[PDB]
């Protein structure tokens, strides 16, 4: 059963089929199946108790010490060291939810175990995989044309910004950033409606530069319309706040040029000496004087320059930034308004970016200076500054924010929402029980084992709150059967009402699709699994 | 781990004179200009050295121990590179800091100079550092 | 039972008045037979090595 | 056996000969099989294969499964061989050609051990199968009218027969139909190069769509490249194999000048030849420009202040199908930019899927290419995915070259089988017992597929031995009902080609193991 077949033949001649036949393993049949479903059942028993807003967070440990701690399921996979292969499918699949929608990145996980965990009680009673695999199928259409029912509409408008104030805040709930979670949300939501394409487009997440950085605390972080910079002014006399700055964006060292050519200058004689030491001067005064020509108030490079350039630079009154990187020049561009100059005859009037103020930054007694840039124009770019007591909270925020960048940019591509909090899973439930029972016996009992394994969300929810799991579910889905309500779920928080819509529990109807098909592909790619062959 | 012998064993080539005081050594490199040379040693910071006056002229620590150094040919102070960590970092000594960073023992600058191979045990753009 | 948040104690005691249940209903399903009957032994012992 | 001091062969040589290797080799053949027998039908399953690195590898293709096993018997690897012949020829039946040669071996088997001839059984392979390819080509069902209609019914019912045993065989219909759209759409050589596969992490599989023209994965955009329009109405694109950057002229190339003046002109020179290559370029009216080669942030930043879309390093293939498909021409000169070297598209946009970003060529109306954007949940499901697609494609592809089918789910085999049988009653008798084994082991494929399916096979096999005898060519095994039924009429198509091949391979690699009378092995040499 084990190691495969071994016989060296029955004429005792050496019987080699595959290289180190000896050294590998094979499982074959329905063991194999119970061992995948085993791993999977591990995974998923794992990632449930960090779940809902009473979810706890897991403490990641890296090859080298490095410490994380998140309540972010795909996360907790990712850096999570498995080696059986159901473990690393079931990481791809939160890694899978994460790319396509950026939440729910647990419960795909949980659904995915509560899946196969009925699949091996309807295995062991004598159906084929492949029946339960299209059985699983039909049920989660089912859910999907229920979730398209009962699902509600919101205005995506600038003028009002109360649902997806409400949304961000659901999303954000589950995150150690509950604490602010209100300045969270609206940050959140703020800095998605500046940068996104109004006509229902995509929304660029190159636009949204997100930095952290230690000391304060983490009610201090904050949306900038503009851009933060690790760099500072070159020369250190030169004044720490401009306002109303004219900003000129350059590409080129401020350095004579050289041709990329090899190229070799000779020198035969003092006059050839005299004419490239009064060439060098002129060209560091042309450069500085064709900057000020435009009237700039501020120059930003990107590959640095010297003790001449910068003392021309502050004698002038142009105070002056080096080193700027590649991606901060883009975002400053755009920011500002003003275009890139690869050199400095090519810099004119109609190029200058405008900034309402630049300013440099302190951090206590840490030396650091970060430049700031903001109060333009129409900036279409935006930066999100978050501070802390701890890396790790900041690190930790940071992922909550793209959680909750990540919804909000779900809701621009569709404004169609269904009430959380485990109402959406018992409705598709109670949809998916009564379609089973127009259904013919055989699938029967697949619908029931998946309308049975989507009832674990609210029952994982339960139990992470306190309550009683099956009790409460029960009591729930009773209610939810006897008035027409599909958006009663677990009153994780205790608020006195089970009725979502005044709680404000709301997700996005593309997260639970999104969910529930990626659960129902890989449950059953995993179910179609029947042999492993590994060294 | 190349070092030449102590005398020399010439008849004064005028090349004899070498310095070689090694007061610091892991990445003993000459520079574009020979009036410089920069060492690095296990104790994370890079030196660099005036062959001429023979002194110290600023010591660079922004890492662990640093292992490989490599340099931009421009005056010897437009820009060197260090991935001793796992962080390659770009200096620049006409400030002394650290201009820009990859966090990802044989990297080589690449001839063009818009780009840098990190050989560990990637050719990084350094105009979109990706 | 366990999973659903049933306490490993509630069980013990629904299980034994399930079997005490059973064991109503097994006795109810049950037939008399007599010794003086060859048939009926020969058939349980054919049953117990059917199997064999 | 004797010491012989002065030794024939090499020390370690290992020799093996008679009846005993030749039955030896019959059972590494049966034992390759039955490695990828349970992929086998709509009711299949998937195997996993892990290499020495760890990666795994998911697949129903009998051909990769095979190719996966790090296989080392030398009779065993025949079945391989003739595994990839058959991938290589037709594309799909790379677990019957293998199921084939192992049954026909193992039906010869007891007359092997019995000291029969080989010569015998492979000339009685030879006639057997000879007959058997006859008998396809007669009576494979072809309509000679060749109307459009007709035509695209039977390519997409001989493509949900193709996918009908893959992962993807819920959406089989939605696959079929769509990989018959990306085929018909080829010009006259049915290139592989010239239909796309970009799997894209992310989505359900109804998420994937079909491209009416060329979309490629965003290429390392440089500085300033956000700031250019993402979208245009009617864009001309330029295909280029330029490199726009400021860089030295040639590698050998050197510049020696004397004077600062001739320093300042060899500066401005070089940027005006980049400047003038740029501006040669953007007059040509183009908006959308796709380079081979490098495209440097000063041509980026130039073209975004002209509202003008760049994009270099795109591969090869990229470009050649971008080419096929707005209708334009690849230039390594920008000198003689004219409209007829100029692509065009309807619509050009770049949007995100499940976290990157792609750019689309879309509403090309004489487009001769297709992009396939697949998705999934992780790696190995769109592999496998990309895989079925391949079968299907393949399948799709035959067809058009000739639109000749049979039935599937064992009709034909059971047809041929019976005709065999027919034919073998009527011959002398020593030949006879081997046809006979020959029409024996063609059962093979619908025994396999009730066992796969969970049936009783000895009943199904009854029941279509005896449907065939009474009358009905294309009576099958119907997996859903549990029984038999026409196939023909169940839309189950196949293409004769298939089941050509694949009885023509299993014969050769059936004729080629049983010529085997002796092994001989070499000592290893340099074994480390
Ligand atoms: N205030 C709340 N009351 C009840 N349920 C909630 C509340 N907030 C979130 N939930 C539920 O908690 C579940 C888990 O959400 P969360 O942990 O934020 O992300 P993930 O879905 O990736 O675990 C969601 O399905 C949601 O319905
Ligand atoms: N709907 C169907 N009903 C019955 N048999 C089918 C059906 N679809 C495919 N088959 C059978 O499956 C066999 C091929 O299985 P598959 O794994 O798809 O290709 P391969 O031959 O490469 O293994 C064919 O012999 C065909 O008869
Ligand atoms: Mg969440
Ligand atoms: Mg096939």
Known sequence: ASMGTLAFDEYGRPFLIIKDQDRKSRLMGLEALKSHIMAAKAVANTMRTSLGPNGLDKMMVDKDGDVTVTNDGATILSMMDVDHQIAKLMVELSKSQDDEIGDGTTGVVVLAGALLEEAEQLLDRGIHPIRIADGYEQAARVAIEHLDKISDSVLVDIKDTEPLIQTAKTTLGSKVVNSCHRQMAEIAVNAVLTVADMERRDVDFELIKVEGKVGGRLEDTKLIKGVIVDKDFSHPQMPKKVEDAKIAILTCPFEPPKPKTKHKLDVTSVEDYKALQKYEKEKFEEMIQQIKETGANLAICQWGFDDEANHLLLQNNLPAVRWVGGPEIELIAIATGGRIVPRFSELTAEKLGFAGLVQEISFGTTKDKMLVIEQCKNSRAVTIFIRGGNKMIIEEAKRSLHDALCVIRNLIRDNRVVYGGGAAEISCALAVSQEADKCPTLEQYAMRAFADALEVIPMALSENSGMNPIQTMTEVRARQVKEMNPALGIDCLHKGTNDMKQQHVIETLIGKKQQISLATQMVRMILKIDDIRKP | ?130 | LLQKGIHPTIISESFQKALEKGIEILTDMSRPVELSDRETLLNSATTSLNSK | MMPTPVILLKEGTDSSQGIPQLVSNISACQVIAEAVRTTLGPRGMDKLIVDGRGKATISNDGATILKLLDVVHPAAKTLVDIAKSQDAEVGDGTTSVTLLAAEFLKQVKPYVEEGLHPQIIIRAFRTATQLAVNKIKEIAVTVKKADKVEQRKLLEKCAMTALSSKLISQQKAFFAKMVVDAVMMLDDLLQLKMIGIKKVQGGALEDSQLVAGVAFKKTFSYAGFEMQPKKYHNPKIALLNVELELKAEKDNAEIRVHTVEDYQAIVDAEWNILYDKLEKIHHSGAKVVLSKLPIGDVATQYFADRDMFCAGRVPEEDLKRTMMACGGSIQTSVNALSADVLGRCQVFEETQIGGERYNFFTGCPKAKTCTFILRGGAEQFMEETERSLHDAIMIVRRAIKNDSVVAGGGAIEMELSKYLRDYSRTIPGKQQLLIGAYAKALEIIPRQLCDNAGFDATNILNKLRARHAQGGTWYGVDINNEDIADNFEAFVWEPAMVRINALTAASEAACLIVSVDETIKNPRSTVD
């Open chain 2, 1 to 130: 781990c190349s070092v030449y012998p102590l005398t020399f064993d010439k008849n004064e080539n005028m090349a004899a004179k070498k310095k070689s005081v090694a007061m610091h050594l892991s990445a003993c490199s000459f520079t574009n200009s020979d009036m410089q040379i920069l060492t690095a040693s296990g104790d994370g910071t890079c030196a660099l050295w005036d062959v001429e006056s023979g002194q110290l002229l600023q010591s660079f620590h922004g890492h662990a121990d640093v292992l490989c150094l490599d340099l931009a040919p421009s005056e010897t102070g437009n820009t060197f590179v260090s991935g001793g960590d796992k962080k390659a970092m770009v200096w620049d000594m006409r400030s002394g800091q650290c201009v820009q960073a990859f966090e990802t023992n044989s990297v080589r600058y690449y001839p063009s100079g818009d780009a840098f191979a990190s050989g560990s045990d990637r050719l990084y753009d350094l105009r979109a550092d990706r």
